Each structure stands twice: as structure tokens, then as C-alpha cells.
Amino acid sequence: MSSRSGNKGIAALALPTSDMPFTEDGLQPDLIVNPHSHPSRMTNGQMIETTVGLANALQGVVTDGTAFLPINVQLLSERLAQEGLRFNGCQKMFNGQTGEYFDAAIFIGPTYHQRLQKFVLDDRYAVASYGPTDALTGQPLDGKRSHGGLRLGEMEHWVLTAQGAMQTIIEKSHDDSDGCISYICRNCGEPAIYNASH
């Protein structure tokens, strides 16, 4: 999900409506975004959108927040104050799980949010120890579409070497991609023919 200021975020928590923090007057959020996402990215448009959306929701209005329109953060906050809320958008919230109130008044408001179309169910993949194999090199086919594979590339081999791993390298490469036994005459140095059954 992402707000209209360009703050992407992967949804990782499913909190029932009782576990969600709530304000003094019963308002709880749909999304809880970390405050640390702001200062490095300087996405102040999202915060101003929230501080205007609170007053807009209370007044039952819709406002134009087009770029380069005149804006006064002080006047928007005073609009919040005249709407009955605090000068800042901050409110008294209670922890949903334990019922205790937070010491710090929490900034909560309606921020427009977009669900970007990169779904987990499309992108997740897990393949067992067998499937379609490439005819030429005897290796698994490429990608989820071909129904097998996923690549342990050059840099993964470099990293496993840097750890002195091997064994795991033997497993993943040989025993899991195209492991085979190669017979060599040892008297002439050329590949030979061996068959235990026949």
C-alpha cells in the first residue's frame, strides 16, 4: 500500500478491531504507519493531507489540495482547532490490547491510501525437489511460469564461497540442479563409458 506522497509499505499485521488503538471518542485507524517513515523522505504532503482531512471529515467537505495552490499550515491547524479538535491533529488514544492510554497524544487522521498491484500471492513461489528440467543442461526450468527453478546465481555462489560453505554448495548445485557422475579413464584422460547393471 502507498499514500499519495509516495510512501510504499508492505502490510504486515492483522489486528482485530479490539486490538486496534482507539482515541478517546472511539476513532481507530485502518492503517498504522510508523512515524519514522517521514523525516528521511520529507513527505510532508501526506501529513498536511491528514491534517486537512480531519477538518474536512468533521465539516463534511471535500477540498482541493492541488500542487502550488496557496497553503497555510498554521491556518489549517487553526481550522482544526475551530473544528473542536486540538491545534495539531493529535488526540488521546488508548492502547487496544491493554486499555491503557498512551502518554503522548497521537496524530491520527484520514489519509488517502492506494493499494499497489504487487500482490504477495502472485509473487510467492515454492518448489519441491522435482519438476520440469531443461533438456540441454539438465537444470530446472526458469521461473514460476515454467513451474520450476529459481536461480542461485553467480553472486550467491560467491557469498557461499566467502563463508567457506561448500557442502551446501554441493547440495544446492550438484544434488539439486544437475548432479551427475562423470567417468574418466584415468589412463588417457578422456571421458569413458561405465554401466553397473549392464
Q: Which of 17, 167, 187, 195 binds Zn ion (CB under 5 A)?
A: 187
Nearest approach, Cβ of 92 to another protein (angstroms)?
10
CA torsion, ordered 6, 46, 109, 64, to nearest 10 deg: -110
Residue with cell 486537512: 52
| Residue numbers preceding breaks in the chain (C to N > 2.5 A) | none
| Cα 182 from Cα 194, distance rounded (Å) | 9
**Nearest residue to Zn ion on Cβ basis:** 185
Binding mask 144-183 for another protein (x = CB under 8 A): x---xxxxxxxxxxx--xxxxxxxx-xxxx-xxxx-----
**The entry of Zn ion, another protein, none that residue 70 binds, CB within 5 to 8 Å by partner kind:** another protein
Q: Which of 44, 82, 184, 192 binds another protein (CB under 8 A)?
A: 44
Considering the complex, state which of residue 75 and residue 185 has its C-beta at the smaller distance from Zn ion: 185
| Cα 1 from Cα 13, distance rounded (Å) | 13
* Under rule CB under 5 A, residue 69 binds Zn ion: no
Considering the complex, state which of residue 18 and residue 187 has its C-beta at the smaller distance from Zn ion: 187
Amino acid in position 184: I
Three cell numbers written together for 131: 519438476
Three cell numbers written together for 87: 491545534
| Cα 18 from Cα 42, distance rounded (Å) | 32
Three cell numbers written together for 165: 560453505
Binding mask 4-43 for another protein (x = CB under 8 A): xxxxxxxxxxxxxx--xx---xxxxxxxxxxxxxxxxxxx
Binding mask 88-127 for another protein (x = CB under 8 A): xxx--x-x--x-x-xxxxxxxxxxxxxxxxxxx-xxxxxx
Binding segment toward Zn ion, per CB under 5 A, in 33-41, 53-61, 150-158, 178-186: 178-186
